[PDB]
């Protein structure tokens, strides 16, 4: 007895489609993502090498696992024999462990970038980022070795239980306690920084009003030396070409504060007040460019990673414990929900990241 046996051939030709059309959309979405990076030298970044390295594993799953997941899922048996299904399992288990852990190494980059901006930009390289893809492809294999030691029924060793729980801890719970701890850190920095920056513009605006309606030099001085402190901070908030243009606009803002200050120090209050009038002009113009998506979008990867892989890994632990009102259709349905992760990852990075959306539309 296998449940599939009582599902007629009308539904079986509609269930060759969806799993042929899900398999295909994984190959040509993750290949459109590698060739986007392969085909751009501004996109040749240490953090866009990882996205490709990710899409690389999700491309392996789409050709090694997904088309030969279906001849088993549709019928309910296994035609291809012993020497085959030992390295069919090995791929599925590791290639989906790679897929998961690559989401950690991506979130290690974001974390160390947004937390140690200055110092880790030197360690951040291709070579240091090649170590990461590698040591996650090596550790991934080190999970599928344990069952290798120990007809028509392809499945993995559920006799040793210590393996069962180690396999689900080393490739899932660690990676989601880690994801939750990094996204925690990141969201709190990323939210403090806009607050810090909001306090900077609040100072620069509050103090301008002080100068406008000021009766003497002394208070114009203290007010201009506060905008300066504040401008010179905003300038450090967020290599060489793009950013250059952003900082230059502050180097005007600052120079106007400097020229005012001089007149304030020379005792020329009315002169300073005029000199400061130019500042509103400059504030007014860098109000558009003040008025956080990189951090919003990793909330969709966490979300679409939780929703995809949690069920399979929960249901993977109470099965060997507990049919406790359990149908092998629900263990098969949440196996495709975790394969679906290898689809959803590329399609979030086109709506999210603005360099894959300049690519696709062409």
């Amino acid at each position: 007895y296998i449940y599939q046996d009582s599902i007629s051939l009308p539904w079986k030709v509609l269930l060759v489609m969806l799993l042929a059309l899900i398999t295909l959309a994984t190959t040509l979405s993750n290949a459109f993502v590698i060739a986007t990076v392969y085909r751009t030298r501004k996109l040749h970044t240490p953090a866009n090498y990882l996205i490709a390295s990710l899409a690389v594993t999700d491309l392996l799953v789409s050709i090694l696992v997904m088309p030969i997941s279906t001849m088993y899922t549709v019928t309910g048996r296994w035609t291809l024999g012993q020497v085959v299904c030992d390295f069919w399992l090995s791929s599925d288990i590791t290639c989906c462990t790679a897929s998961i852990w690559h989401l950690c190494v991506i979130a290690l980059d974001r974390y160390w970038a947004i937390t140690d901006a200055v110092e880790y930009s030197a360690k951040r390289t291709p070579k240091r980022a090649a170590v990461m893809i590698a040591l996650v492809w090596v550790f991934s294999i080190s999970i599928s070795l344990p069952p290798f030691f120990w007809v028509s029924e392809c499945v993995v060793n559920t006799d040793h239980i210590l393996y069962t729980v180690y396999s689900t801890v080393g490739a899932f719970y660690f990676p989601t306690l880690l994801l939750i701890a990094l996204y925690g850190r990141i969201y709190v920095e990323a939210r403090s920084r806009i607050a810090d920056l909001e306090d900077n513009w609040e100072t620069l605006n509050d103090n301008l009003k002080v100068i406008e309606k000021a009766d003497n030099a002394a208070q114009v001085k203290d007010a201009l030396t506060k905008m300066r402190a504040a401008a010179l901070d905003a300038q450090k908030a967020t290599d060489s070409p793009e950013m250059k243009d952003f900082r230059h606009g502050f180097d005007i803002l600052v120079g106007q504060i400097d020229d005012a200050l001089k007149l304030a120090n020379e005792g020329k209050v009315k002169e300073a007040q005029a000199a400061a009038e130019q500042l509103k002009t400059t504030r007014n113009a860098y109000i558009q460019k003040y008025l956080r998506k990189a951090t919003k979008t990793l909330g969709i990867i966490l979300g679409a990673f939780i929703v995809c892989w949690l069920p399979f890994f929960i249901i993977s632990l109470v099965m060997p414990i507990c049919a406790c009102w359990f149908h092998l259709a629900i263990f098969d349905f949440f196996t495709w929900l975790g394969y679906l992760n290898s689809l959803i990852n590329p399609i979030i990075y086109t709506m999210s990241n603005e360099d894959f959306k300049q690519a696709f539309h062409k």
Partner: antibody, heavy 119, light 108 residues
Framework: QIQLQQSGPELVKPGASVKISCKAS????????INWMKQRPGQGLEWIGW????????HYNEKFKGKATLIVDTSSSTAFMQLNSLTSEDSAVYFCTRPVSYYYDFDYWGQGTTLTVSS | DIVLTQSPATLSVTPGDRVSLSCRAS??????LHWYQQKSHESPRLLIKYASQSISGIPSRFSGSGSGTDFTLSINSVETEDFGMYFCQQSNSWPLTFGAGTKLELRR
């Protein structure tokens, strides 16, 4: 008698550059922003940029970025604008002006200088 | 850049007549708007600064009104000396931008 006395008109070959003058009098030249303006016969004016004489700091209109360079010679209390790699679209009238402040009863313009770009 | 649309392009008035010159900013420029006369190439004469402030020495028949995007220079009774180009400039944000002119022509 506050006054801005700009230099005379200039025939100039396309490809060449020019320096235009704005000698300022009857107010401490170093205490006030200066703006430079372009106007062609049938049209509105456009702003090129300002300099602050006391420091020589400058902002420019993206439009005129590589074209105009504003400098200043404090010692003769004058301002210069150097336009470079000139074209037919450069023949026009050039005004320097002390801008209009909330705090001062008037503003102040040069008489204009007229560039002619031809072979 | 902020676009100052002046209307209308050209305007014919009989001396005596009341005249409202309109200047419309593509976005808000608050009260940072000034008005100029230009008879010809000669350097512009500032009529009105900061929208409503009137300039020492400019005659009383000239006055300004407005804020945000809609601005009006106003000659309550146009004289014969009043032909020329009326120009609104904004100083809200960089770059400074002018209008293309209302060309005021007198009847006789």
């Amino acid at each position: 008698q506050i006054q801005l006395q700009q230099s005379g008109p200039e025939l100039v070959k396309p490809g060449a550059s020019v320096k235009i003058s704005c000698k300022a009098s009857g107010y401490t030249f170093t205490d006030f922003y200066i703006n430079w303006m372009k106007q062609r016969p049938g049209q509105g004016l456009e702003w090129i940029g300002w300099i602050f004489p006391g420091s020589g700091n400058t902002h420019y209109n993206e439009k005129f970025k590589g074209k105009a360079t504003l400098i200043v010679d404090t010692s003769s209390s004058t301002a210069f604008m150097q336009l470079n790699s000139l074209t037919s679209e450069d023949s026009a009238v050039y005004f320097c002006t002390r801008p209009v402040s909330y705090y001062y009863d008037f503003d102040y313009w040069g008489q204009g200088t007229t560039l002619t770009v031809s072979s | 850049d902020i676009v100052l649309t002046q209307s209308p392009a050209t305007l014919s008035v009989t001396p005596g007549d009341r005249v409202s010159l309109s200047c419309r900013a593509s976005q808000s420029v608050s009260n940072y708007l000034h008005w100029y006369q230009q008879k010809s190439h000669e350097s512009p004469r500032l009529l009105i600064k900061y929208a409503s402030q009137s300039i020492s020495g400019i005659p009383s028949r000239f006055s300004g009104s407005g804020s945000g995007t809609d601005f009006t220079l106003s000659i309550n009774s146009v004289e014969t000396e009043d032909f020329g180009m009326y120009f609104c400039q904004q100083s809200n944000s960089w770059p400074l931008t002018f209008g293309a002119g209302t060309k005021l022509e007198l009847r006789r």
